């Protein structure tokens, strides 16, 4: 299924994953194309925190869902 990962700035990336894909694997895929380590990938679905050990189907994440890739760095 196709999902949309939209960052805070506005940058949206397309990701190809399956319903059985773990959130952790999702971050690993994002890192490979964006270069952003999972450590800073605080994936939040409109307020719903996505646990790495959970799957996309766990949070009822359907196709064309917009996930928010929040880069939580240590600064500010």
């Amino acid at each position: 299924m196709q999902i949309f990962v939209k960052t805070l700035t506005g940058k949206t990336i397309t990701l190809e994953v399956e319903p059985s894909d773990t959130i952790e694997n999702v971050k690993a895929k994002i890192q490979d194309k964006e270069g952003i380590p999972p450590d800073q990938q605080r994936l939040i679905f409109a307020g719903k925190q996505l646990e790495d050990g959970r799957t996309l189907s766990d949070y009822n994440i359907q196709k064309e869902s917009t996930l928010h890739l929040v880069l939580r760095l240590r600064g500010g």
Binding site: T7, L8, T9, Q40, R42, I44, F45, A46, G47, Q49, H68, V70, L71, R72, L73, R74, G75, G76
Partner: protein
């Protein structure tokens, strides 16, 4: 209360959990939501 209290909630609902980082970003920007988004995204002032 806080001057950016309602702002934090707006961010939280959009896709934020840590209100601390939100406050820090709002504080650094002087009171701007979109600019604060870049603040956290960059991890401070690049």
């Amino acid at each position: 209360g806080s001057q950016w209290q309602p702002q934090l909630q707006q961010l939280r609902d959009m896709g934020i959990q840590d209100d601390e980082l939100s406050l820090r970003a709002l504080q650094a920007t002087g009171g701007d939501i979109q600019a604060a988004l870049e603040l956290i995204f960059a991890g401070g002032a690049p």
